[PDB]
């Protein structure tokens, strides 16, 4: 169980990886989703809406692929409120930047996963639209797995990862990197 | 990842949990799939057939629930041989005497070493292998192959008929590509028991 964790209720955390995008955009402006990526986000959006859950929020960063993945999914989840955060931004001396980028991933974990809400009386269902690296960090961290193994988790574009966090901080992984709802010819990791 | 491992090509391991069944069945022969369980198995079969992979083999637990799940899945994978093994029968629950657990631990380790860790010197191309079994068996194999601690077993929750996909590189690096995938099943067909 996560240490120093008390919540009022159970929290269901859904971590969605960005869909495929033009990684060769000169400026962020240009790193939009590929046509395949747009279809992926659509499929992830239909899947999420089909769950019969009233989601509490969709948290995401300000990167072009993040905003675009979010926009598409969000149209399937009418009324669910969106929250922009730069703790989910993926960075782009070099060495000092990278340390800082890593520290931000931990802050993301701390701020959004390890921290529970006092207002929250009942079970919550929370979506986070993220880059691969923050998902796999969050998974290892919440599950108390060796952080050195985070890169052993291979997350498809648009995939859904579901963690369950009980009031006493016991955590269960119900699924990781699910793209079972996409036709196999639509699945990508880049 | 795995130590003392050198394979000639990549190995894709698909670990499939059995479909919903009659837990109340009085003998092992009575613990057959429910009608919903048979629908789940069908869905998993459809999904596996749709990946466009030539599966090398279907290795399955000899428990009735695992047999019936395999019967249904294998109809979608014509020409893939099926091999029954006692090594993949479910282990005693982690959440009941100690010699039972020693026995089960030893067997499931044997299963891991025989089916997951052992590279075939006759492999001549990338392989795709299906193992139809049980939650504790899969949890153990996943954690062992990824070097996750034994307290991780019970933190992994696998749906009935779910697909867990590991990729084993020739030098022994292991990636977890998906765990507990039932994303191909409508939510109103999804169960854990």
Numbering used by the authors:
A (entry chain B): -1 to 0, 90 to 179, 192 to 289
B (entry chain A): -1 to 0, 90 to 182, 192 to 289
Reproduce the article's own wording on this structure.
PGAM5 is a mitochondrial membrane protein that functions as an atypical Ser/Thr phosphatase and is a regulator of oxidative stress response, necroptosis, and autophagy. Phosphoglycerate mutase family member 5 (PGAM5) is a mitochondrial membrane protein that belongs to the phosphoglycerate mutase (PGAM) branch of the histidine acid phosphatase superfamily, known also as two-histidine phosphatase (2H-phosphatase). Despite harboring a canonical RHGE catalytic motif, PGAM5 lacks a typical phosphotransferase and/or phosphohydrolase activity for small metabolites, and displays instead a phosphatase function specific for Ser/Thr and, potentially, histidine residues (Takeda et al., 2009, Panda et al., 2016). Overall, the catalytic domain of PGAM5 adopted a classical phosphoglycerate mutase-like fold with the canonical three-layer sandwich topology, which featured a six-stranded β sheet flanked on both sides by α helices with the first four parallel strands arranged in an alternated β/α manner.
To provide high-resolution details of the catalytic center, we also determined the high-resolution structure of ΔN90-PGAM5 in complex with phosphate. The β3-α3 loop was the region that showed the highest degree of flexibility with two major conformations observed, an opened form in the apo and off states and a closed form in the on state (root-mean-square deviation [RMSD] of ∼0.9 Å with an average Cα shift of ∼3.9 Å for residues 175–179). Binding of a phosphate ion induced a number of rearrangements in the active site resulting in two distinct on and off states, which were termed in relation to the “in” and “out” conformation of H105, respectively. In the on state, in addition to H105 all catalytic residues were observed to assume a potentially catalytically active position. This conformation was most likely induced by the closure of the β3-α3 loop which moved E177 inward, triggering an inward swing of H230. In a concerted manner, the “in” H230 likely forced an approximately 90° rotation of R152 side chain orienting perpendicular to H105 and planar to Y108 for cation-π stacking. In comparison, the stark difference of the off state of the enzyme was characterized by an “out” position of H105, rotating away from its catalytically competent position. This movement was likely a consequence of steric constraints created by R104 and R152 that retained their “vertical” conformations. Although this conformation maintained affinity for phosphate, the all-out rearrangement of the catalytic residues presumably depicted a catalytically incompetent state of the enzyme.
